[PDB]
Design a protein around this nucleic acid. Structure first.
Lengths: 181, 193
DNA sequence: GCTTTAAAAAGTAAGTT
DNA sequence: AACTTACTTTAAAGC
């Protein structure tokens, strides 16, 4: 079987879409978020930056939000709870509890050894490498749908997976190819 | 549209001074793409600048994506997507499009004031750098710049880091970085002044 | 496709000191 | 040069 005994992954960012189940009046939500930016012309939502869970929140009039910058699910839960309470403080009432869905997870990691990307680019099927533009090999994992950036140092960046087990599977699939040589 | 296509190729080839075989490969690739959709609506300017890039790669006539980007009035964005698209959309393989840093030595050496002796020492440094695994991840221009710089010194035809940085189109800091690594890791005995 | 957000990797770039 | 900052690569409502 494929040797993952040296693989190490670290969560760097978690992106979640959330549904508060309430119509939001963005002009009134601005007072709730200190420093918030809102230009409805260029982008429909408020760009809010929280300090405690240090995360960015994109707030929409449909009561939907996107939370990014989260290092954990707990980061997201707490951001939603703080905003939800602030909203309540301004009159908002919600039809039900917040629906939280992780949409994207970015991991950084190490696969165990170094690589001569020139060789990898010529042996690993379905990968991209353009050192004139970027120093890593771009590898698209079909299932589970995700991308892994592989560097000469053996460090990697996995994006797109929506769970930890998926990212581990994506790395397992890449290591299956790399280990044939 | 094929008429406007070939006309932009003339601008590209004139500005880049591309030889006939490269220009002809660019055109042939384009018509080879025509039979293959040319995407629903991928710009007529994007696909040809892509083709000339792939042409230069297929024929080993070095031409940094920077050089093709400005004279074509655009950026690495759609250029890169159309390139990457038309590339595997065709019969193009990473091996065939593979360009070694040594493939740039002649062009850059011509601009710096030649000497086969220098070009030879630069290629040797570059070949040796690969074998000693010191090149992975580094940009071709930075490595060839340092090699050319080091060779000019070794062969007594010194060229400054500034002169080399400008033809290779990298900063002096990048040349300094690549050059210092190559000298130490390959144990090159560079003479004084 | 685009607009806005965040995050890391390693290489390169640019402004100041 | 060193530092620092920064750019390359990889859901939301509606144009």
């Amino acid at each position: 079987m494929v040797d993952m005994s040296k693989v190490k992954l670290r969560i760097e960012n978690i992106v979640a879409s959330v549904d508060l189940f309430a119509q939001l009046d963005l002009e009134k939500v601005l007072d709730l978020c200190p420093n918030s930016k809102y230009n409805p012309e260029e982008f429909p939502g408020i760009i809010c930056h929280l300090d405690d869970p240090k995360v960015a929140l994109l707030i929409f009039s449909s009561g939907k939000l996107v939370v990014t910058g989260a290092k954990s699910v707990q980061d997201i839960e707490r951001a939603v709870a703080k905003l939800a309470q602030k909203l309540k403080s301004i009159g908002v009432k919600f039809k039900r509890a917040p629906q939280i869905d992780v949409q994207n997870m970015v991991f950084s990691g190490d696969i165990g050894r170094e690589f001569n990307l020139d060789v990898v680019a010529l042996t690993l099927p379905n990968c991209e490498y353009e050192p004139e533009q970027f120093p890593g090999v771009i590898y698209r994992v079909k299932e589970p749908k995700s991308v892994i950036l592989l560097f000469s140092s053996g460090k990697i960046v996995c994006s797109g997976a929506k769970s930890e087990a998926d990212a581990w599977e994506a790395v397992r699939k890449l290591l299956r190819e790399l280990d044939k040589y | 549209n094929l008429a406007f296509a070939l006309s932009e190729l003339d601008r590209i080839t004139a500005q880049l001074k591309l030889p006939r075989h490269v220009e002809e490969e660019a055109a042939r690739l384009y018509r080879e793409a025509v039979r293959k959709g040319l995407i629903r609506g991928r710009s007529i300017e994007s696909v040809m600048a892509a083709c000339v890039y792939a042409a230069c790669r297929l024929l080993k006539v070095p031409r940094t994506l920077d050089e093709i980007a400005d004279i074509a009035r655009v950026d690495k964005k759609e250029i890169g997507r159309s390139y990457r698209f038309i590339a595997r959309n065709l019969n193009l393989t990473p091996k065939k499009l593979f360009v070694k840093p040594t493939d740039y030595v002649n062009k850059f050496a011509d601009e710096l004031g030649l000497s086969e002796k220098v070009r030879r020492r630069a290629i040797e440094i570059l070949d040796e750098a690969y074998k000693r695994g010191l090149t992975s991840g580094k940009s071709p221009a930075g490595l060839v710049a340092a090699a050319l710089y080091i060779a000019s010194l070794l062969e007594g035809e010194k060229r400054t880091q500034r002169e080399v940085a400008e033809v290779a189109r990298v900063t002096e800091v990048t040349v300094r970085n690549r050059y210092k690594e190559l000298v130490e890791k390959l144990k090159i005995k560079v003479p004084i002044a």
